[PDB]
Ligand binder design. Structure first.
Ligand SMILES: *C(=O)[C@]1([C@@H](O)[C@@H]2C=CCCC2)NC(=O)[C@@H]2CCO[C@@]21C
Lengths: 242, 204, 250, 212, 233, 198, 244, 241
């Protein structure tokens, strides 16, 4: 056949590219970073009405000051989350402090290209790249609030706002026009709630969508359904307002 | 300290006319404390008999090991193991643990099913085979057993006679050993049948 | 470096055949004929010494090998494969038996050991099956005389008489005609020589034929005396001269 | 060293001394002998400072990891067994630690677990560890009641350490108090034994044998 | 042809080529441009940072390996992290064990040898990134160009990445000029920005878009980004 | 060492174990239960080295429960004891052996008979009407050798033990803080909460 | 590299089937037929020897019936050599169990273990599976007489009567036709021979082409006894049952 | 030694070996689970490609991981055993170290992890199995029902089915299961389960087995009669119209 870490004639790694495709098929995830916190929202997208929506966990906590959202083959994200939680906790044990959001992200991205059938560079025992992208958001004293997009390629970009998943090209275009350096946390919330509604196949309600944020004061929190439902109602009103 | 003097016990085997006998006491103690008066030290796999003195846990482990090995042997060879062969299996199994040996004193007894010839053999803890024609002793009262046997023994005794001889050897030797006694059992073996008799002795 | 062939090279085809075993058997088919016959008091195995050149010294190449003092082997197929199989067999007779029980293994068990070695070359990663079929003849106290055949698959079966290789079909047929359960060793040797003649194209004498027997104990071949229970090997390769003497009464 | 921890109606009282010695040398009179695993768990340190400090801080990291993984507060039983099993892995290596793992969970209520480097893990109501333990036990055993008030309980612990600080040459410095409630532990100050002794003597009338 | 001889680095084509290696080199060309040039007192790295969206950051392209050494990358970022990390260890080793700063020429040899191993064995893949190493050691200022093929060359200046050829011709021209910008970092840096803008086309170098790094005689390898590079735009 | 006693009567096995846990100069606990239920009809008592004691007991418990789930069946007492003997006989020749002695009392539902097994840390196993570990046997065996009868009722067994515990509380130098008694029979394992004065 | 020559013995077909297992089963279907019939007072194992000659030594032969334990035996259908590899490990597992618990291994536990080993070659390792199917006839004190079957996939099931190898469809239909819960060993012995007799691809069904074994609990004893019939014994029972 | 990447990505972003693993599940006998207000019921259908089996010994479809949790599945039988064993082992280890039995979600997340892992490790193919895991968290009375698949993904359901014709039976459940009023009885819950299976089992008294799980390790499997009784009362519900 062909090696799992082979280069295409264009200078790209097949498996990594094909990986990005699976990610495109995943549920939408959006992140907005403001000077008042970072918001992270996702599309639950249950496959049947019998599936209990709240058992869908696409937004998880890394540490009190770091949380993340996922899009793609979600099962592939578990070992990534584990590695992240361990990395942040370990850092605290060694340095009696919080791990910087960038550092935590870089650690996760280090697993990324550790795949192959015997690549001469160490002992990368993992048959294929991860099939899921991650939005890592957090806060730290040196660079305040931050949003990162970690891909199976091993590269991670910092964004003021970013969307990954099925409705990303569309949603990202929206974020391009909506984002500005002075958004309030509440604005970002509605804004994320709004874009999700535009790209989601289903009609967005507090059961097929979920919000969350991370603030320096209270850290990472996942908004419960009641809290979001109200924010949803508030959006419908401001939209019908003009 | 001495793994061979913790539990106590003895075993003795003798050859007679077209027969062999193997006997042992039934004591199992923890130094001065008597713990069991039913710890038999004789086992058999087919028509081959094995007595074992020494550290009780090893006596138990070795029996379990030889059962295991003689079982597979039967399944592959499609016949029961013979005295001479088992003796070699015992030897090599013990030597395999040359630098971390089982603290035991094995004794093999039986009659070759094809030649009818009687057979007994002893081993040190690391497998050295002692193949005597007369008798073999083992245990905390082995010195006494050597004395008893050397005097009481004579060649070609009949089954009924060898029984008396081996029993008197075992009995009087055990009574001069603090760690032996509390019961005894004697096996009289012939080509066709094997009788097992429990003896009556002091219980102190 | 490092053998990275950790997967089987012999696998099942849709028809359920195991290709490499089949091909190996085909290689056996092209090999020089060899045979074995069991008598009431012995066994004989024989083959043809197909000298690959007149400059070659046929004696320096034995197709009939002693595995234990009471067991011998002969084959048909790839000579180099046979040679290593004999080395491995002689060693396994020791490591898995003599060093444990203090005596040589009985024919069926040693055969079983060889068979296992062959079966593994049929499933282990990175290898091909052995391209040979062996005929092993031996004797042991509780089983008497026996003759076995071991094929590339690792399968083995007991025979009264049989042949393998080039003219196996013809030879097997000729054997079925002359074999009975009352043959004496000499009779089997005779029948063996006749059977082998039909398979030989050119010269047929004690220098072109290789033949051994599993029979009585040869105390003269022990090398020492003093131990009553040690009487000598039962395996004995016949000499060029010994064969010719019997060819005259052909 | 003298450390104690006891269970009662209002939760758990934890009191320790703060002296560090190497032979007859007093290395410190202001050492911390209580590790704040996290806001709900406390650990006492007796024996080797490095060993206790290191593994109890590590315990903290393992508890945190548990709560992230199970989205639920770790039980005192479970936290104590993590330490216990770690320590048991090193049995024979020379670790030296006598410790009390204390917490208040909804599921268990007030819970104290004694854990030492021999691998021993014991659940109990009252525990005293250290070269001053016997002194503290004397005071504790005769005044302990399950229905003690949080105020009196705190004092009993403080007094028990005081008794030990006085008689045990390897105990003293100051007393560190802690009250453990289901909502977390509450620090109750650092009481210099020096001043505490004279004060207690006068107000209580005890320590009559000492001239003040 | 090619298709049958490009499935892995362990295969030579009928003409003696190594396609996987060549495909790797392709990843560099697709990378943002970066430039390097040195006088006799300093060495400079000017790199164009590329952004994903206008809501994204401009990926860092310069990495410090020690106080006297550093590099710029073009291609797979992860591979530069690995290679620079290895360079960091090698510099660290030289210091700890021999109390000696690692020679820039020696670093080059070490990078070449690490890259070569990934082009002769089954299973691995060549590194897909180009590197420009600058540093001041016991023999002055230095600039090196590293190619995934394992080829490392010492130069006065150069550029790698998309449209790199612009800056490269400019430098090959300005040579006699900048090679003498001794004792004046600002002049060397400006010359670097002038070479890099020779590869622009899309936009123009902005504040959060330009990245510069310098090292020399009495200047520990330091990196300037944003406001700090404003005085060069 | 602690007190580990066992007596097999007509239809049950009774195990008595001291409640004290002493660490050096002080008795840290006087309510310790030195036992683990291996299965509904099998109980194991233990005494020995500080940490090894419980770690071993719980390790054995885990394995039996796992076997019970996998096979949806309860291993016979004899089976559970051979498993335990082997575990200790392995340990005796390892880097750091388990210094634990145990008594295994179980009711064989298939044979409908109680069984008592004594196994020391070396993997020495024996089946007895009654047994003990440590010094305990020294003070009690003469009493059991005297009053023991194969047809004793559970009530008679408890009276014979009480006698043993009294002798122990008289001649033994240490205060083991009384014992916890448990009965194992056809209906399972139950604890005699009233022995502090039975 | 090597990848080029890897058959990939452990992957799924687009239909979710395991190529190798399927092909191995196909291989097994050309193997001599083996029958297993469980009665109220025993179990019967019978097998047809594939390929034979006048010169084949039958007294010293065994290619289908193997003793695993003193209470368990198996009938083989497939590659003999592969079977022997599995049989030996099965024998070792039985003894390990015995030494650990001092009780003979329950029949299902041994079967599940052997099947688990087979299942392994199905999910990892890159090796061909064993071209073997077993019929297990054994007895234990928890379920008494039991009859099991395991194939290349690693699946196993219990039966009152069953067959493996060639013409199993024909054999199964005939068995399902005349089997009765209250059968007796002697009845089953007869059913077995009749079934093989009608499914043979050979002319007649003679003794030299059969192997026979029974696991009974000899009333005059109280223990379990396995009996691997000898040439002459098969020849006899072959006449009695009316097949001469 | 063998570490070939069997589960890799294809151009369209799919992992065929995992995809084909699902196909093996579709082929397996149907399985269903529905949770009542105070229990969970697991139903499985029995094949009939061959019938002359010994039901006493032939491996049952519902397995107990611990005394309070059960696991059923659809797919390769040989594969399910590996998962069941690992799950049973992890159940004991959890009790040994946390001194508390596993929650149903925990046990599920474990099994799922093993599955996910087999989708990106060299030399191994994914599990051709999908599972339904049900039970009651220690000291809790709220019923739990989870489902896992080859990919390693898992989630909880009010009711769910897997295996052949699961498409059919799921529909039945989607228009016969009200989250507002879940089968408030062990009886009416078992009935709804039997009804859902009859949509695909086609008259199979001996082809339908049910297991009822109640709080506090109360688990029991119904007998042919008990079930057959439910079938009977159901065929009448139809005829009576
Ligand atoms: C008490 O246990 C003690 C302390 O020094 C020590 C210090 C900090 C935390 C752990 C406890 N340990 C010792 O080894 C000395 C000598 C006697 O006891 C100490 C005072």
């Amino acid at each position: 056949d062909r090696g799992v870490s082979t280069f295409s004639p264009e200078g790209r790694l097949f498996q990594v590219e094909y990986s990005l495709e699976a990610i495109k098929l995943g549920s939408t995830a959006i992140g907005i970073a403001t000077k008042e916190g970072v918001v992270l929202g996702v599309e639950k997208r249950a496959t049947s009405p019998l599936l209990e929506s709240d058992s869908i966990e696409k937004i998880v906590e890394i540490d009190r000051h770091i949380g993340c959202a996922m899009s793609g083959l979600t099962a592939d994200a578990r070992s990534m989350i584990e590695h992240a939680r361990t990395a942040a906790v370990t850092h605290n044990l060694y340095y009696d402090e919080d791990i910087n959001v960038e550092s935590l992200t870089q650690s996760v991205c280090d697993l990324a290209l550790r795949f192959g059938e015997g690549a001469s560079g160490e002992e990368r025992l993992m048959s294929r790249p991860f099939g899921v992208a991650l939005l890592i958001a957090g806060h730290d004293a040196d660079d305040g609030y931050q949003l990162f997009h970690a891909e199976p390629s091993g590269t991670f970009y910092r964004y003021n706002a970013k969307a990954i998943g099925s409705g990303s090209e569309g949603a990202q275009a929206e974020l391009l026009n909506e984002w500005h350096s002075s958004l309030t946390l509440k604005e970002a919330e509605l804004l994320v709630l709004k874009i999700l509604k535009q790209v989601m196949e289903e009609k967005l309600d507090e059961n097929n969508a979920q919000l969350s944020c991370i603030t320096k004061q209270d850290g990472f929190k996942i908004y419960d359904n009641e809290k979001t439902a109200e924010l949803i109602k508030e959006l419908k009103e401001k939209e019908a307002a003009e | 300290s001495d793994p061979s003097s913790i539990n106590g016990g003895i075993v003795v085997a003798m050859t007679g006319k077209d027969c062999v006998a193997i006997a042992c006491d039934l004591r199992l103690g923890s130094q001065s404390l008597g713990v069991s008066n039913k710890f038999e030290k004789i086992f058999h796999y087919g028509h081959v008999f094995l007595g074992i003195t020494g550290l009780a846990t090893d006596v138990t482990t070795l029996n379990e090991m030889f059962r295991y090995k003689t079982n597979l042997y039967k399944l592959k060879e499609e016949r029961a193991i013979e005295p001479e062969t088992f003796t070699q299996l015992v030897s090599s199994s013990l030597y395999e643990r040359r630098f971390g040996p089982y603290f035991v004193g094995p004794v093999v007894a039986g009659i070759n099913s094809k030649s009818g010839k009687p057979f007994i053999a002893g081993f040190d803890l690391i497998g050295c085979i002692d193949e005597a024609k007369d008798f073999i002793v083992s245990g905390t009262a082995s010195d006494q057993l050597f004395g008893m046997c050397e005097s009481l023994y004579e060649p070609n005794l009949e089954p009924e006679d060898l029984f008396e001889t081996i029993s008197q050897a075992l009995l009087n030797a055990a009574d001069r050993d603090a760690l032996s006694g509390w019961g005894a059992v004697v096996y009289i073996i012939k080509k066709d049948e094997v009788v097992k008799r429990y003896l009556k002795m002091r219980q102190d | 470096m490092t053998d990275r062939y950790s997967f089987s090279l012999t696998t099942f085809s849709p028809s359920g055949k195991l290709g490499q075993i089949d091909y190996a058997l085909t290689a056996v088919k092209q090999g020089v004929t060899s045979l074995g016959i069991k008598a009431t008091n012995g066994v004989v195995i024989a083959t043809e010494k197909k000298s690959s050149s007149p400059l070659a010294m046929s004696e320096t190449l034995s197709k009939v090998s002693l595995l234990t003092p009471d067991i011998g082997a002969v084959y048909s197929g790839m000579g180099p494969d046979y040679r290593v199989l004999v080395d491995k067999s002689r060693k396994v007779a020791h490591t898995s038996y003599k060093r444990i029980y203090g005596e040589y293994p009985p024919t069926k068990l040693l055969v079983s050991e060889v068979a296992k070695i062959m079966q593994e070359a049929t499933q282990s990663g990175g290898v091909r099956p052995f391209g040979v079929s062996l005929l092993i003849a031996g004797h042991d106290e509780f089983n008497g005389f026996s003759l076995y055949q071991v094929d590339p698959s690792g399968s083995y079966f007991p025979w009264k008489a049989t042949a393998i290789g080039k003219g196996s079909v013809a030879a097997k047929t000729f054997l079925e005609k002359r074999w009975n359960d009352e043959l004496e060793l000499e009779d089997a040797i005779h029948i063996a020589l006749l059977t082998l003649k039909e398979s030989v194209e050119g010269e047929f004498n004690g220098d072109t034929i290789e033949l051994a027997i599993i029979g009585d104990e040869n105390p003269d071949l022990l090398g020492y005396t003093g131990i009553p229970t040690d009487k000598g090997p039962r395996f004995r390769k016949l000499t060029s001269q010994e064969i010719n003497d019997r060819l005259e009464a052909l | 060293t003298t450390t104690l921890a006891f269970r009662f109606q209002g939760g758990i009282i934890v009191a320790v001394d703060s002296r560090a010695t190497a032979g007859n040398w007093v290395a410190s009179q202001t050492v911390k002998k209580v590790i704040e695993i996290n806001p709900f768990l406390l650990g006492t340190m007796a024996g080797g400072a490095a060993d206790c400090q290191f593994w109890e801080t590590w315990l903290g990291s393992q508890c945190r990891l548990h709560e992230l993984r199970e989205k639920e507060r770790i039980s005192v039983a479970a936290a104590s067994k993590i330490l216990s099993n770690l320590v048991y892995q090193y049995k024979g290596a020379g670790l030296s630690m006598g410790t009390m793992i204390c917490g208040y969970t909804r599921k268990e209520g007030p819970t104290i677990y004694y854990v030492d480097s021999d691998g021993t893990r014991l659940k109990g109501d009252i525990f005293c560890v250290g070269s001053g333990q016997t002194f503290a036990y004397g005071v504790l055993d005769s005044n302990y009641k399950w229905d003690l008030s949080v105020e009196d309980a705190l004092y009993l612990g403080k007094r028990s350490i005081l008794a030990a600080a006085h008689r045990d040459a390897y105990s003293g410095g100051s007393v560190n108090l802690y009250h453990v409630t289901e909502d977390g532990w509450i620090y109750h100050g650092n009481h210099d034994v020096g001043e505490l002794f004279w004060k207690v003597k006068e107000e209580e009338g005890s320590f009559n044998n000492v001239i003040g | 042809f090619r298709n049958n001889y490009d499935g892995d680095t362990v295969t030579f084509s009928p003409t003696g080529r190594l396609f996987q290696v060549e495909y790797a080199l392709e990843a560099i060309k697709q990378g943002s441009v970066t430039v390097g040039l040195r006088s006799n007192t300093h060495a400079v790295l000017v790199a164009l940072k590329r952004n994903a969206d206008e809501l994204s950051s401009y990926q860092k392209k310069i990495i410090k390996c020690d106080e006297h050494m550093g590099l710029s990358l073009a291609g797979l970022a992860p591979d530069a992290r690995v290679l620079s990390n290895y360079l960091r260890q090698q510099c660290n080793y030289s210091s700890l064990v021999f109390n000696r700063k690692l020679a820039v020429e020696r670093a080059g040899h070490l990078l070449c040898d690490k890259a070569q191993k990934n082009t002769q064995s089954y299973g691995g893949r060549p590194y897909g990134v180009g590197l420009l190493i600058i540093g001041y050691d016991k023999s002055g200022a230095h600039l090196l160009e590293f190619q995934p093929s394992g080829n490392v060359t010492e130069l006065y200046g150069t550029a790698i990445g998309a449209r790199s050829q612009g800056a490269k011709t400019y430098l090959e021209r300005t040579l006699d000029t900048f090679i003498k910008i001794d004792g004046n970092p600002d002049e060397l840096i400006k010359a670097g920005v002038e070479a890099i803008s020779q590869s622009l086309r899309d936009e123009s170098l902005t504040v959060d878009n330009l990245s510069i790094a310098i090292v020399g005689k009495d200047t520990p390898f330091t990196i300037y980004d944003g406001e700090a590079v404003a005085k060069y735009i | 060492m602690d007190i580990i006693l066992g007596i097999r009567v007509q239809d049950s096995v009774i195990l008595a174990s001291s409640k004290a846990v002493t660490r050096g100069i002080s008795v840290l606990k006087d309510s310790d239960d030195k036992t683990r239920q291996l299965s509904p009809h099998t109980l194991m008592s233990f005494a020995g080295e500080a940490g090894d004691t419980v770690q071993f007991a719980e390790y054995i418990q885990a394995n039996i429960q796992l076997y019970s789930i996998r096979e949806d069946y309860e291993l016979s007492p004899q089976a559970v004891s051979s498993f335990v003997r082997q575990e200790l006989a392995k340990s005796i020749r390892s880097r750091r052996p388990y210094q634990v002695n145990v008594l295994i009392g179980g009711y064989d539902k298939k044979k409908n008979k109680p069984e008592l097994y004594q196994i020391d840390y070396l993997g020495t196993k024996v089946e007895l009407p009654y047994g003990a570990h440590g010094y305990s046997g020294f003070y009690t065996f003469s009493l059991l050798d005297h009053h023991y009868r194969p047809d004793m009722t559970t009530e008679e067994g408890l009276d014979l033990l009480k006698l043993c515990v009294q002798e122990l509380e008289k001649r033994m130098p240490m205060d083991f803080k009384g014992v916890i008694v448990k009965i194992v029979d056809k209906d399972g394992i139950r604890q005699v909460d009233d022995f502090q004065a039975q | 590299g090597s990848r080029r020559y890897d058959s990939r013995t452990t992957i799924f077909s687009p239909e979710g089937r395991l190529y190798q297992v399927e092909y191995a089963l196909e291989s097994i279907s050309h193997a001599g037929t083996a029958i297993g019939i469980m009665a109220s007072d025993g179990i019967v194992l019978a097998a047809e020897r594939k390929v034979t000659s006048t010169l084949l030594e039958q007294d010293t032969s065994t290619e289908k019936l193997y003793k695993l334990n003193d209470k368990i035996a198996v009938a083989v259908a497939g590659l003999t050599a592969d079977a022997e590899i599995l049989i030996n490990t099965a024998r070792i597992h039985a003894q390990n169990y015995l030494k650990t618990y001092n009780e003979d291994i329950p029949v299902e536990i041994l079967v599940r273990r052997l099947s688990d080993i087979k299942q392994g070659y199905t999910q990892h390792g890159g090796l061909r599976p064993f071209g073997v199917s077993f019929i297990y006839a054994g007895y234990d004190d928890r379920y008494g007489y039991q009859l099991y079957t395991s194939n290349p996939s690693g699946n196993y099931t219990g039966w009152k009567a069953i067959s493996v190898g060639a013409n199993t469809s024909a054999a199964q239909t005939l068995l399902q036709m005349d089997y009765k819960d209250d059968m007796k060993v002697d009845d089953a012995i007869e059913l077995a021979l009749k079934t093989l007799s009608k499914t043979t691809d050979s002319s007649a069904l003679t003794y030299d082409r059969l192997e026979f074994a029974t696991i009974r609990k000899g009333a005059n004893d109280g223990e379990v006894y396995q009996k691997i019939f000898k040439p002459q014994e098969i020849k006899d029972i072959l006449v009695k049952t009316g097949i001469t | 030694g063998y570490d070939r990447a069997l589960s890799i990505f294809s151009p369209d972003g799919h992992i065929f070996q995992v995809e084909y693993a699902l196909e093996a599940v579709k082929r397996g006998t149907c399985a269903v689970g529905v949770k009542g207000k105070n229990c969970v019921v697991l139903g499985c259908e029995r094949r009939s490609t061959l019938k002359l089996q010994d039901t006493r010994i032939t491996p049952s479809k519902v397995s107990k991981i611990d005394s309070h949790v059960v696991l059923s599945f659809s797919g390769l039988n040989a594969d399910s055993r590996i998962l069941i064993e690992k799950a049973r082992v992890e159940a004991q280890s959890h009790r040994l170290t946390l001194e508390d039995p596993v929650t149903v979600e925990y046990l599920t997340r474990y099994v799922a992890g093993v599955q996910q892992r087999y989708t990106q490790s060299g030399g191994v193919r994914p599990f051709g199995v999908s599972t339904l895991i049900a039970g009651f968290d220690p000291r809790d009375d709220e019923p739990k029902l989870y489902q896992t698949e080859p990919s390693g993904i898992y989630s909880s359901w009010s009711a769910q089915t897997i295996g052949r014709n699961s498409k059919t039976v799921r529909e039945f459940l989607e228009k016969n299961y009200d989250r507002k009023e879940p089968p408030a009885t062990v009886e009416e819950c078992v009935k709804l389960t039997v009804r859902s299976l009859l949509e695909v089992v086609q008259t199979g008294a001996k082809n339908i087995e049910i297991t009822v799980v109640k709080p506090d390790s109360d688990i029991v499997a119904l007998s042919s009669e008990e079930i057959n009784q439910y079938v009977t009362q159901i065929e009448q519900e139809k005829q009576e119209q």
